[PDB]
Structures are given as C-alpha cells and as structure tokens.
A paper describes a structure:
The PI3K-related kinase (PIKK) [name] monitors the progression of metazoan nonsense-mediated mRNA decay (NMD) by phosphorylating the RNA helicase UPF1. [name] is a member of the phosphatidylinositol-3-kinase-related kinase (PIKK) family, which also includes the ATM, ATR, DNA-PKc, and mTOR kinases. Despite the confounding name reflecting a possible evolutionary origin with a lipid kinase, and in retrospect the ability of some PIKK family members to bind inositol-6-phosphate, all active PIKKs are Ser-Thr protein kinases. These large, multidomain enzymes share an overall similar architecture: a C-terminal catalytic module (comprising the so-called FAT, kinase, and FATC domains) and an N-terminal α-solenoid (that typically serves as a protein-protein interaction module). [name] and [name] form an unusual G-domain heterodimer.
The corresponding 3.6 Å reconstruction not only showed a similar mode of interaction of SMG1i, but also several features distinct from [name] in isolation and the [name]-8-9 ternary complex. Globally, the α-solenoid of [name] rearranges, consistent with the notion of a stepwise compaction of [name] upon binding first [name] and then [name]. Locally, the mode of interaction between [name] and the [name] α-solenoid differs between the two complexes. In the binary [name]-9 complex, the portion of [name] that interacts with the N-terminal HEAT repeat helices of [name] changes conformation, exploiting part of a binding site that was occupied by a short N-terminal segment of [name] in the ternary complex. Indeed, two hydrophobic residues of [name] (Leu456 and Leu457) take the place normally reserved for two hydrophobic residues of [name] (Leu351 and Leu352). Importantly, the reconstruction of [name]-9 showed no ordered density at the active site for the PRD, which is in contrast to the ordered PRD density visualized in the SMG1i-bound [name]-8-9 complex. The structure of an SMG1i-bound [name]-9 complex reconstructed from the same data set as SMG1i-bound [name]-8-9 did not show ordered density for the [name] PRD in the [name] active site.
Author numbering:
A (entry chain C): 170 to 285, 293 to 343, 361 to 435, 455 to 519
B (entry chain A): 615 to 626, 632 to 682, 698 to 877, 881 to 895, 900 to 1060, 1067 to 1099, 1103 to 1151, 1178 to 1259, ...
C (entry chain A): 2139 to 2232, 2245 to 2427, 3607 to 3661
The structure:
Amino acid sequence: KLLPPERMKHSIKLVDDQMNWCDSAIEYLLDQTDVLVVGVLGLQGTGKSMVMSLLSANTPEEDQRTYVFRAQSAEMKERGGNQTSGIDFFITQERIVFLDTQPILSPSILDHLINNYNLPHTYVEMQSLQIAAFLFTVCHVVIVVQDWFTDLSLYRFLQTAEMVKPSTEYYPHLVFLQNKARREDFCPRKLRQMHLMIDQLMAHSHLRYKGTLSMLQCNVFPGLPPDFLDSEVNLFLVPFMDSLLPGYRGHPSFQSLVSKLRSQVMSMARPQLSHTILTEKNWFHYAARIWDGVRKSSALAEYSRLL
Amino acid sequence: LSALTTIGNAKNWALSPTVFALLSKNLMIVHSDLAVHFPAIQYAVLYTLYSHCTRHDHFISSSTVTTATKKHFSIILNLLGILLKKDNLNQDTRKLLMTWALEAAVLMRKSETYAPLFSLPSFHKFCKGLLANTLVEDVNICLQACSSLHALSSSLPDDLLQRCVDVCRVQLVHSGTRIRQAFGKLLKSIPLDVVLSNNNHTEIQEISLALRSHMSKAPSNTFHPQDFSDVISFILYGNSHRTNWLERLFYSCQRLDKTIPRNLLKTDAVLWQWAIWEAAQFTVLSKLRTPLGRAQDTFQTIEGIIRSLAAHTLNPDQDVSQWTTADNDEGHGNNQLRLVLLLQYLENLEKLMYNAYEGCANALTSPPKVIRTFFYTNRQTCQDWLTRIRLSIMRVGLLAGQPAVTVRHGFDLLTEMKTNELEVTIMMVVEALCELHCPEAIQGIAVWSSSINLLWINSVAQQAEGRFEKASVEYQEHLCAMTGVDCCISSFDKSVLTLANSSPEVINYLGNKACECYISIADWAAVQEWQNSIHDLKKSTSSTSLNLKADFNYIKSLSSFESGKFVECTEQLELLPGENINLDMKKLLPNMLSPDPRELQKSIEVQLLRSSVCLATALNWQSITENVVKYLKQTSRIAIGPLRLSTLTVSQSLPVLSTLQLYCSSALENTVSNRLSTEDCLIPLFSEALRSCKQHDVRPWMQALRYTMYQNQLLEKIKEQTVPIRSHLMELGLTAAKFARKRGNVSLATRLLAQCSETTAQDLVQHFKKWGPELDIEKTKLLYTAGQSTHAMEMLSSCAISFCKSVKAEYAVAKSILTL
Amino acid sequence: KLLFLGSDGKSYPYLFKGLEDLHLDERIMQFLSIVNTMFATINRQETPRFHARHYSVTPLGTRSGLIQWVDGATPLFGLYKRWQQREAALQAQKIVPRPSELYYSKIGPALKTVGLSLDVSRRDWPLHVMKAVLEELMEATPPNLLAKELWSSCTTPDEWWRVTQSYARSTAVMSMVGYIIGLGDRHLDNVLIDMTTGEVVHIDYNVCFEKGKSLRVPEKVPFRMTQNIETALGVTGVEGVFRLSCEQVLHIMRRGRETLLTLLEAFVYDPLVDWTASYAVSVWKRVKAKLEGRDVDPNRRMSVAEQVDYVIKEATNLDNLAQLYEGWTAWV
Ligand SMILES: CCN(CC)S(=O)(=O)c1cc(Nc2nccc(-c3ccnc(-c4ccc(NC(=O)NC)cc4)c3)n2)ccc1Cl
Ligand SMILES: O=P(O)(O)O[C@H]1[C@H](OP(=O)(O)O)[C@H](OP(=O)(O)O)[C@H](OP(=O)(O)O)[C@@H](OP(=O)(O)O)[C@H]1OP(=O)(O)O
Ligand SMILES: Nc1ncnc2c1ncn2[C@@H]1O[C@H](COP(=O)(O)OP(=O)(O)OP(=O)(O)O)[C@@H](O)[C@H]1O
Ligand SMILES: [Mg+2]
C-alpha cells in the first residue's frame, strides 16, 4: 500500500524544439518537497548527454545505445551536427531532477536555420541567452562543461546572462567540469595556473564558484597540501575512455573520477528558491510560469535592439 | 633514466656508483617531496629498478658477483615496505608497487629453500605494507593485495594472521562480488586455530566508533518520506522497488553546505546501520506520523507482524507469508537479514523514544522542545505498548537467533514487574542466556528469583558451561521429582559423575533441553532411550502437552551415516525435504523454510550428507564430478550467510557451527576434485586450539570428527597415493578427548579414547591399564578424573619410567613428572 | 596541564604536579601492574578481560612530578550534574544546588524538629535522623542515570551486552583491588568510566592504606557501591557475575600473595618513600592480614565466599551510608 508511482526508463522532452513548453512529466511527480535541480551548459561537442546519463542512471560498463540521454552516433560526427535539441528531463529513483540543454552558439543550428528578425545569428544568441537565464533561475546546481581550456568566450557569456535575469535575490551554484582531460592537465603546476586564471576571470561574477566541491578533498592528490593553492575553486576533470616510459597514463581511472563526481553532485546543498516552500508539482508550475514570462520579456528585446 | 636501461638491463660493468644503489639509495630524495609535484621521476626510477631486478630473478639465489649482491633482496623488501606503508602515493605508482609485490610474493614460494627469508625484518615490513594496502577505495589494488596474501598464506606468524582475519571479516560484506569471493577464499585458507581466537578486532572497533560518532551528532532531518517508505517496504514485505542503491541513497542524504570514512562507505553493514538509524530518527522526529498511516497505524502494523512471527515460533506449520517462503537461495538469506534489521529498528526506536521523553547526557543530543513536550504527555501510552509487545519481541528475537535482544527485553520486563506471566519471562531469559554461554548471569538470576519453585535454573546454568552429562542427569532427576513417575534412563554412574564435576511448559522445556543435550554429545542410543522414556511417560501421565520438537528422521540418518551403512542412509535421506539425492541448482533449499538458523544448519548438513553418500556410492574422472562440484559450490555459497550476518553487526566474534560447516564444505569440495591428493582437503582444526580455544565446548569437534571418519573409511576404495589421514585423525581425536575430559564428559571422553586406541568405574581401570605419550597421559588424566587416583598415579609413574629411556623424551618426561 | 607530540603524530597529554611528593604513586602503579600481570592466564579463556586500568607517574626530584593523562574517560559526577540541570529546567518550565547545601537543607529541619540544633557537634547526631534523610534523598534521584547511559551509548544489542559484561567485571576487579589496598575518598569525581568499553578507572590514589579512618568523618564502606553502581550491573544486582568475578579475583590474589608481600616488604624499606604525609610496618601487617583472610577475626580465617559476602554487606548497608561525608554522594 506504499508502492512508488512509476519508474522512468527514458528521458522526455521538457521543451519543444520550437521553444514551446511540454507538460508531460506531471505523472512522474509527487507532492514531496526538498527537490534538487541540475542544469548543464557547454559547447557543441562537450558531452553533456554522456555525463548526465552517467550521473543519473548509467554506468561506464553500459553502452551508448542504452543510455538515458541519446548521444551522438558515428554517422553524425562526420557531418558535424548537433544531437540534443531543446531541453530534456529525467528524474531518478532518489527524487533528483536532471535537466539537459542543447548546444549554444552551435554552427549546426545556424546552418539548419539558414534554409528556413534581422539575422539568424541574433536569434541564436538570444535563444542561448534565454536558456542560460532559465537554467540560472530555477536550477539548484549548474555544471559547465568545456572540451578545451582557455575559451575566453563562455565566461563573458555567463556574466552577460546573469545580468539579464527576470528578477532577497538568489544566485545558483556553479561547477566547472573539464571534459576530455589529458595528462598535462593533471599536474600541480598547471592546476595552480588554472585556479589563478579562473579567480581573475570571475572576480565580480556575484556567483558561488568557490568554497564547495574541492578537488583536493576528493583524495585525487594524496600528497598535495591544501595551502599550496590560494583559493581552490569548484573544478573537476574527466579523462578519456579507459613515450620514453611505458604505461603511466597520467591520470586516475575514469570510473573512479566519474563515481566521485556523481557522489559530490548528489551530496550538494538544496537551498530554497523563493520565500515559500516549493514541491515537485509546484516547482514544475513555477518553471513553466517563469518560462512563459521570460519568453515575452523586455530585457531580451532591449538587448536585441542594440545589435 | 630511459637511456640508463641499457646498462641496467645488461646481461653481463663494475663502476663506482652501482645502478642498484644509485636508484635505491643515491636517489632517495625523490620519495620525500618530489613525488608530490613530479611523480613522473619517481615512477621512472621505480620502473627502471623493477626492470633491472626482474631480469636477475630479484636476486634470490645470492641471498665475486654473488658476494656483491648478497644484500639486495633485503634492500628491495625494505624499500617496498616503506613505499607501501605510505599513504600519499599515486595511482600509477601504487599499481606498479603492487605488481612488483605480487611478483616477489609469487617468486618467494617458487621453492622451499627460501625458508630462512621468512624471519628477516624486511619480510615483516613487507607483510605490514601489504596488509595496509588493502581496504582502500580502489578495487584492483585490494584484489592484488588479497591474491598476494593468499599466495604465501603459510609461514606467516600469528600476529599477521590475526589482522588478516579481521580484514577478511570486514571485507566479507562488500557491494561488489569479486572482492567478496577473493576474501572468502583467503579466509577459508586461514587455519581455524586463529579464526576462533578471542583477540580484539581493530576493523570492527573502527566501524563501531564511526557509528557511535554518527549517532552522537546532531539530527539532520534530511530523510525524505520516499526513502523511509522504500526501506519499510523492503523490510516488512521485502520489495525495495529500487535497482548499489544504498550508496546512492547515503550520498543523496548528505549536504555540502553543512563525516563517515570513505573507505567504509562500500560496506553494506555500515550503510544498513545508517539507514536503520536514520529511519528511526525520521519516525520519532515526525511524531510517529509516518506515511504508513496514522499514529496508531504504525503501532498496529508492527504489533500484528511481531505477533504473527511470535505465533509461528510455537507451531512451525503456520507458514507465515512474506517471511517463510522464498523463490531462490537469495530469498532465504534475505528473510533473516530483514528480520535482523527489523529487530535493530525496534531497538533504535525504543532508544530514541526514551531519549526524547527524558533526555540523555553526553550520549545523544536533546530533541526540539516540541518533540519533548509531545512525548512527555504520551509517555504512558508508549510504555504500555512496549510492555504489551515485550513478550512477542522476546519470541521473535529468539527465533531469529539474536539472544541479546531478548535478554535486554527480558531484563526490562523483569524490572518493570515491581508490583501467570512471570515463569515464561524467566524461561525465555534463561534460554537466551544459555545460548550466549553466560553461566554467571544464569546463576545470578536463579538466586535473585529464589526469593519469589525455580530450582531448575541451576541445570541450565551448568549446561551453558558445557557439562552435558551432569545437565542431563539433573534434568532427568528434576522431571522425575516434579512429575511423580520414574523418568530415569541408562547412563554413567551418578556417584562417579558428581565427583567428576509444576506446569506443562516447564515439563516440555526440560524434555526438549534433555533431548538437545543428548544430541549435542552425539549419543544416538541415548536419544532413542530418551524418546522411549518420553513416550512411556506421556502415555502413563496423559500430559497432552509434551512433544519433542526434533525431526527424528534426521537423527536416524545421522546415526546410519556415522555407522557406515550407506544403504539405509540413502533411503532415510530420500524422505528429507529439499532437492532429491544427486544421481535446478539455484533453488536448492525447499520452500516454507523458517528463518530460524537451526533449520538452515540442518539443511546444510543434509546437503553435505547427500553429497557424501553420493560420492561413496559412485566410487564403488567426470562421471559424478561435474554435478557434485556444483552442488558443493552452491552449499558453500549458502553457508556464508551466518558469517556475513555476524559481520553486519558489531559482534567481535563468529559462530563456530557456521564456520565449521563452511570449512567442511570447502574441504569436501576440494577432496571431490582432488580425490584426496593434496593437504588442502583436510580440516584446519589442529592441536593449536588447546591454548587458544579453551572457551568453547566439545560440540565443534564432533562435526570435524564425523566428517573425518568418512574420508578415513573412504581411503580404502582408492588405489592411487593419498595423503596420510591417520595422523590428522589421531590429533583431532586427542584434542577432542582433552576438551571433553576438561568438562566432566566422561562418556564422550571414553568413547574418543576407545576410538583412538582402536558404565562402571572398574570398567575404565580394566580397559585402560609419535602420539603415544599424549595418549598415555590422556588415559592417566581420564582415570584420575574418574576417581581412581591410585591407578592414574601408577600409570603415570610407569609411563615416566618408560619415557626416561626413550629417544627424545623432551616434553614427555617433564610433563609426566610435573603431573605426578 | 601540557601536551607532547610523538614521531607518529600521536598526542600524549600529561599533567604537571608541584609541591606534592609522587614517590608513593609510582610504587602504587607498579603494584597495580604486578597484580594485573597475574591475570594473563585467566584472560585466555574468558570473554571479559580481567584488567585494571591505570596510568604511569614519574617524579622529577622530591616535590615535582609528571602524571600520565587518560582521554575518553568521563567522570560519574557529570551524569548527576546533567540530571540536576534537566530536573531544574523541567521544574522551571511548569544554577543547581551543591551537595553540601542540598544535604544541609534536609538535615536542618529534621534536627530542629527532633529537638536538636545544627550548632551541636557532628558526632553528637542521632542515627535515625541521618538514616531518614538518606532514605528520603535516595528516593529522589533515579537509579537509571548510569544503567541506561551505557544502553543509550551503544549501537547494537550485542555491543550493549558486551559492554555490560565488561563493565561488571571491571567494576568487580577494581573494587576488590581498592579494598585490598585500602583506597579511600572514592567520590564521583575520583571515578571515571569509558563509554567505549565500559571499564571503570580510579584517579586520586592519595587516601589509601586505610588512611580515610583518621579524617574528621571516618569512612566505613570499603568501596563505592551506591544505588547507581549497583543498578548499572543489571537486574540481578550484586548476585550475578559481580560475586563470581570478586571470588575469582580473591582466589588469584591469595594464590600468589607471596609476590605482593615481597613487593610490599621492599616498599617499606625505601629511603625515597615518605609514609608520614613504624607506620609502614603497621600498613604491611594490615595488608598481610587482609590477604591471609584474617581481616577482622582473632584466629578464624574467612573463606573467599564469606569474605566477599561480608565485604559486600558492609559496603551496602544503610547503617554506614548515612554516616558519611556530604561530598561523597551516598545517595547517588
Ligand atoms: C571533571 C574534572 N576532572 C576529574 C577531577 S579532571 O581532572 O579535569 C579529568 C581527569 C581525567 N583523568 C585523569 N588522568 C590523568 C590524571 C588525572 C588526575 C587528575 C587530578 N588529580 C590527579 C592526581 C593528583 C595527585 C595524585 N597524587 C596524590 O594525591 N598524592 C601522592 C594522584 C592523582 C590525577 N586524571 C580525564 C578527564 C578529566 Cl576532565
Ligand atoms: O596439560 P594439559 O592437559 O594440557 O592441562 C594442564 C592443566 O590441566 P589439568 O587441570 O587437567 O591438570 C591445567 O589446565 P587448567 O586447570 O588451567 O584448565 C594448567 O595449569 P594447572 O595444572 O596448574 O591447573 C596447565 O598445567 P600447568 O600450567 O600447571 O603446567 C595445563 O597445560 P600444561 O600442563 O601443558 O602447561
Ligand atoms: N571524456 C570523453 N572522452 C572521449 N570521448 C568523449 C568523452 N565525453 C564524450 N565523448 C564523446 O563525444 C561525443 C559527445 O556527444 P554527446 O552526444 O555525448 O553529447 P554533447 O557533446 O553534449 O552533444 P550535443 O551536440 O547534442 O550538445 C560522443 O561521441 C561521446 O562518445
Ligand atoms: Mg549533447
């Protein structure tokens, strides 16, 4: 007399490809409070679907075909086209809501929009900005994935997006994840440089990007002292799938790192959104309301008129 | 470093700075602090040294050129120990060191001429490093360490084996599967003389400390109702509705804004305890308003479940659903696991309620004011409910084989009785104490109750100590004196035995206890006589309430098997439940199996007997080996149940019956595929237990002897060369005889003495007047304990005279003279 | 109080004592170690270990000294203090008085009503008044302060049973050792308990060798056997494993009393020991008489069972608990 409602087997489309709300996840929500929301931001081929699938209901021992979130296929990499479009949705058994996101400023979207108000570039930029604001207003934790380092363009985009939010103010947490890492990225000398440049590039970001999710506290570097770094920011690295010196790949096992990241993300804080207690159904309604409100907003139009 | 490999890997240059010393002593600063910022240099140096040493067989033969390399193995071992003992190593470096250690360990056992290498301090440091390498987050490292330890299992001192036992115990319950199997095999390879030791376990103590620290912390109130519902459904009904879910739940229940060790997060015991404690806290903190129903709904549900379980104890034919029927071998074990978790949950709930209505000091944090004010007004209701359910809780606890729960509940019930429900409480408490081998508590309760008709408690107190003969005699005398009819049976002389050491429920208890006591010493004739006496007494008394709760078919089967008559044994075994006799594998245990450990032990014994008779009939190499091996493997897999259950809680010890059954199953499995060709087919019970297992009774040696005689008699049907079992059998018989005599069991001791040598005091005198000296000393000791001091003295003096003109006469003349 | 650090990063706290000779303390600890050594054989075939917790002390001349510090031990007075605070808070809902003030608040009115006054000498006090005051005080403090503390500090029932048995055996051994030596001033602040294992350990080893009988308020109880201590052993009380443990301890001590006697003989002839703080001869004779079984008897020697029974009865009778110092806390 206490059986669960139902178990989700595959992700659903929360936002349509034409920027339209899709109310089809109510049957998978209950009247429970204290829910966790995860958002993801990144480039075209960063690997958001793979990381989200591995962190929600998948393990590296599985195959990309049975993953919760559909990943890129062999025939799609050659054409250089995106795979995930719109916004996805999936809830695990632990009552954890996972939200995916389509690529931002991806050339595939522009190419598909060419053969279809002034220029498509402005429309793509506005769409990315709107999705970023939505992810920054109703998500408890946001993870940023970057295929390569020193992009110098995503930080500015995030700073501009945080200033175009709709509305005792609340700032969601952020996580810097570097996908497809190499041995050169697993050295203390480079780690310090990464931390200093990150701190100097987000001096007045007004966000929570430090004091939580410390890499040094994850036992990755057993002998590295915490005082060696001036300020250990919330950063994490992910290596590839599992030469005068044989062996010595230069980084820990991929499974161990993904497991540690999953545990750290699962044990993250869950602060209140507004000055009222929100439930699963209430959270969904709030998300739909803010989505509709941001669609017909004035900040986006004002910013677009300047371009 | 890479270029130096040309000279390092040379096959024969005598330069001033030796390459070995250069990479082992000159470049020793790279392991101090350079390994933290530049681990590549350390890895390269270690790789070069390993490559240069592996080409010369790690310099083992040496331990001109030979004289120069006379101190290389010690240096290598010392370096390995120092590096492995560290806690700030890299993954690649640790893996390379583990591989090198495994190779060295395997090569160390390649020959028997390297025996002196097991005493150097370098070897001890290496073993310490290997022991410290296991029990880490990495799985491959643990597997490599376990394999290396299992390789050179022998030649290690008791100090290392003691820690290895604790490591295997804590690792027996892991979220993975390979780790459990590896540690299980390693544990099986350890002799029983160390596994049964009463030494303190550091790992169990650490787990207990972590749990205590977690409970002592302030409440978190982060447990969601869905998690509680899932746990309740998995405990009351067995369905969890989840697909390593414990680790995920534990990680999701934590918070980063606001401390259990990570290495202990992979253990199911810690996770289960944490989940139960959190569920109890959520139930108490929610004013008993759990999603299961209203405030009284939870009480009614728990009361009904406990009442049904308690009722099933009286009549095992009830066959309670969701608690007695399983679908495979996993369900049977899961049932017992759920029962244990339920008992723990009830205990935690009681502790929380007590701390919530009054408050503890330096133990648990005080709950909010609302909880205290709500529990203070409804304290009478809670006390009444607990008191009303204590009787059922005691029965449930005894059924699940948890005497501690019933002992605590009985003590609380007796304390609350400050004002015919009194005899039953004492009965249950006495039985529980008897199962824990605590004669002092039994005697104390007997004396305390004497001031309120309860003179039979002394018999149970004496029985708990191991004196089965005296206990049986006292039981028969008490039954005859309280019933009015003669219920005595043939046995040894009462005068000699003493010098060597009314309600229907009470009558039934005494009869059942006497039957179990007689079965313990393996006296089939006595059991038959007892059954006849009970039948006659019942027919001449019309009790209509006395009935022995023991399947006589199993007893008859055991007697036939021990007598060597396999023809009748097969027919008797055919009527036993479960899978048919071997001529499909997962569902070996039958349905409607009670969660009582006694039933599981009986089923395991039946399976072993079936396999033994099957092999005996098949013998008189793949005809009957492809199925027997699988059958024994499944039996051994099911026998790891109690061992894991003991580790689930902080018990600091393991059951002797379960451990012996598992060891016997493993020995049988090895003898089936080896046909008695290796020493691994013998029982690890040696004489070493004389100075380390004096707190156990004679029951454990009975199983070992029973299964050893089978192989001894089976040797007559093998023409190929086999290992000698006469020495092992004689050693086991002598040790068992010594332990039997050390407790007054004159009958069992005499039986063992007669068996090794191949009812009246004069009978022993007329039948008694490498292991020769031990046998003579044992005979003299038995005669002295039998009351014939003169005969024992004469035999000891004659023995001393004979040993004085012997060859060795080292531990015989001295012992004989001292005893005399 | 200071602190030292070792090579293994382990902290070893210590205590600095000045103007107080500690030569006798080292000898007492040596005696405790020697008596503990005799329990090596019995500790091989028994679940509860026969051990007496103790620390090490080293003198730094003639007045200074260092005393080893033990962590993880909680004094028994703490539980009583918390209970008093909880009771006061509960009463105020709908500081705490000191033992001296609380005892006087009850001994004053009784004496005034019986016809006497508080100005009379302490020795000139009726026995019934003291007995009544003690009985009234015992009925106020519940005996579950320590009995339930161990239960609330455990995790599993097996652990609770193990700690209970260990605590009972440790308490019996410690009490017997204190009675043989003659340790006095056993108040709540001089006894510590380890919730991790349940063992009991003493602290102030100053009033020993029957030195408590010469104070302004002589003590007749051999050891501390208050309501809380007796209740913490179980429902049986002092007739279960406590009596058996005491008998075993006495048997072991009497079997090897030669070592203790020789050690004490060497103790007397020590130029660095100052008993004054023929006295040593009297102390040695008293210890020898206690070990030989002729504690209080002209020529009859009491057996182990009789000695244990007499000691237990003399340490639990109400005729001796009432006539004692207020700070000894005879009601808790
Ligand atoms: C709650 C307050 N406390 C209890 C009172 S406590 O002290 O603060 C405390 C004490 C421990 N345990 C501990 N460990 C090591 C040493 C002592 C200790 C303490 C005081 N005095 C002595 C002492 C002094 C003199 C002599 N010698 C003579 O008298 N004549 C020759 C012998 C002994 C020893 N106590 C643990 C925690 C805490 Cl809190
Ligand atoms: O030689 P064992 O047969 O193995 O047993 C003896 C002896 O047993 P008995 O009491 O039956 O003579 C005693 O065992 P416990 O009484 O402690 O259980 C014990 O000491 P005691 O003889 O003083 O009683 C010790 O003998 P001991 O230490 O005196 O030499 C012991 O083993 P060992 O004789 O081999 O040492
Ligand atoms: N750490 C990694 N190492 C190597 N290959 C990776 C790694 N992470 C992802 N990939 C691969 O890169 C591709 C990532 O595409 P995927 O569909 O998983 O997500 P995505 O890059 O977020 O896609 P989208 O274009 O829809 O934004 C896949 O082919 C995946 O196998
Ligand atoms: Mg994608």
